Symmetry: none
């Protein structure tokens, strides 16, 4: 059987990096399909196929322009086709999946997708429709706060450079009602949420480099033991920097606490600051628990393959890599059961 | 050991009736796959497996709605998969083939297909792709005139009774560009073309029952000796009705004539009118030549098996039955030719 993983994110920045981090622990390099469309959003690897949910846009870019709607609006997406095709792939059936051409903003003729071992649906509405949601074996939500969203556009984007600060944040809040109505409530269905906030260690930092990252983990989910620090289920803050581990400004600060998140029980691990050298990453990993690693240091090693990645110096890469490991552990138990069941 | 026949025909009129007249000739009764999907379009016989090319649609009904594209458009069909699976079947390889559901409009899980003695692929685009065209051992194109499609929609199809004439003719017009561009040109690749036109015997008739049917037979094709009437190559008109064969109104009228069709030499046989007594059918069959019958009255006998079929009293039934007998003859010769070749190769080893 194929196992299906939802990834809810805005397409701009972290989702690409998050997806690359998830692909690297699941298997080999994910590449576009061999022939066919050069503007295909599909990424294919030996174990995983990544489907961009833009392909299920029911509304052409110019159709949306003529319409009241935007890409966030459910009017603009075809959840019937999305449900049916995701459902078919999970049962080992190949699907003819249309292609949303981002360059031309057009719907291209479809591509035949073969059923993978690991299917990741990634985009704006993976958890929006309940039929789709019931198919997922694991759900991810990458939640960027608006403060950091703004910083990245200014500090880390070249397309936005033609626009003023006024115009860029005008657009952000102009899209905020649709986002709050249609994207943000998907958090409640996620098994793992990575919330990205400005750091508290530096007062008035808006640069997007030092960040407060929260890893919210649902409890009671079968095959998914949440990560914890020192004493599972208690409330802990933890500064690793000391006599034996020296840090630069501002350093590292960890928080671990239970919580109630959309009327579900969760465990929250939090890292504020950035790693200014590699010993701190090694030290942090050695003190976390329930990381779903195969050997001591795997989180570090898996991060070291993508040192150039954005967020590799802070909690973004650390928690995205941990979430990828937990997912692997989970599908192994799903698949273990499945393969033994077949026997 | 698989012969592949191409049947290009428009969706909704006489394509279903045609395919059933061929399976009667090719072998026993053709039934759906045992159990399985109730809406599967595959018909299975002892000798024949017929594949509906709708199965290789890439856009489903609703996808076609939102992509603003018809089922006649190449963009809505996956010709790569169609090609791959036709060559596999021709190579004795079974395929798992998706099913296009006509009631739901969706693509459903696939059905495994075993390689048959005779594989007929019928639908919109059997000759549209040269790779798939290259696998055909024979090809047919059913060319219903625009006047007769409308007649059949009004006179025959009960489903069209919900629509008024404007919607019916608008829908025809809505698909006309794609038909002219992508379907109609496949005629030129067809070894046999059946062209269904309004009658001339009844002036102004438009009721789709009295028909002028042209059987267009491509010349110079190996194992295919076209039907002819009295004197091969001449231009003949024949009214068999008379004092020794009595007919009703309007009667029978045949035309036999050579022609050039897309710059290939063709021999075309025409029936205008309709049969009202069985003697008329037996008399016509008895006077034609190169029918590839195995005995006197095979055509008549084959048509009486399916007497309540539409077009059973005009040239549509007559010439479809005969195309079946020509094809049967052709694959008998090709199988024997292929079998002689294999034995020679086996003596060589």
């Amino acid at each position: 059987e194929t196992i299906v993983i939802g990834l809810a994110a805005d397409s701009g920045c972290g989702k690409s990096t998050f997806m690359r981090r998830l692909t690297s622990v699941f298997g080999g390099a994910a590449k576009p399909p061999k022939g066919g469309n050069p503007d295909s959003n599909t990424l294919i690897s030996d174990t995983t196929t990544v489907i961009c949910l833009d392909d299920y846009h029911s509304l052409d870019r110019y159709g949306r322009k003529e319409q009241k709607v935007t890409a966030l609006d459910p009017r603009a997406n075809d959840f019937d086709l999305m449900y049916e095709q995701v459902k078919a792939l999970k049962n080992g059936i190949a699907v003819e999946k249309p292609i949303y051409n981002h360059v031309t903003g057009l719907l291209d003729p479809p591509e035949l997708i073969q059923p993978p071992k690991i299917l990741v649906i990634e985009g704006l509405h993976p958890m929006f429709d309940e039929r789709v949601r019931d198919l997922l074996d694991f759900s991810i939500y990458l939640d960027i706060s608006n403060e950091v969203k703004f910083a990245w556009k200014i500090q880390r984007d070249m397309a936005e450079r033609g626009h003023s600060l006024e115009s860029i944040k005008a657009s952000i809040e102009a899209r905020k009602p649709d986002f709050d109505a249609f994207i943000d409530p998907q958090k409640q269905y996620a098994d793992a949420v990575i919330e990205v906030l400005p750091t508290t260690l530096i007062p008035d930092d808006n640069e997007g480099k030092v960040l407060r990252v929260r890893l919210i983990m649902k409890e009671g989910v079968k095959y998914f033991s949440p990560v914890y620090l020192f004493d599972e289920g208690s409330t802990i803050s933890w500064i690793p920097c000391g006599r034996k581990l020296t840090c630069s400004y501002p350093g590292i600060k960890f928080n671990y606490e239970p919580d109630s998140y959309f009327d579900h029980e969760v465990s929250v691990l939090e890292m504020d600051g950035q790693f200014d050298r590699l010993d701190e990453l090694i030290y942090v990993e050695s003190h976390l628990s329930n990381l779903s690693t195969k050997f001591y240091g795997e989180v570090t090693q898996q991060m070291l393959k993508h040192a150039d990645f954005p967020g590799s110096n802070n909690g973004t890469g650390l928690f995205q890599t941990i979430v990828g490991l937990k997912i692997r552990d989970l599908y192994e138990q799903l698949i273990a059961n499945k393969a033994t069941a077949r026997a």
